[PDB]
Ligand binder design. Sequence first.
Ligand code: SF4
Length: 83
Amino acid sequence: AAPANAVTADDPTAIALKYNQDATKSERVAAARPGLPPEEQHCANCQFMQANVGEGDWKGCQLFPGKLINVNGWCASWTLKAG
Ligand code: SF4
C-alpha cells in the first residue's frame, strides 16, 4: 500500500544506504549506528525524518527529496532525533 512516490528498492541511494521500509528487515544491528541501541532505531526517531511531509505512516526524509519513507523503516544514515 505504498504511495506513488515512496522510496523503492531500485533507488540508487536507497541501495547505497541499505534502506528498507520495514526496520525488522534491515541491517541496523550490523551497522551499529550510535545514539540508541540498534533494535530501537527506525525512521520515526531519526533526525532526518520530516513529520510535516506526507501522511500517516509515509513521511518525508531529508535525504530523499521528493519521496516518502515509512516511519517504521530504517537506513544506514539513521541519526538520533535531537531536535
Ligand atoms: S535518514 Fe533517517 S528518516 Fe531517512 S530513511 Fe534513513 S533512518 Fe529513515
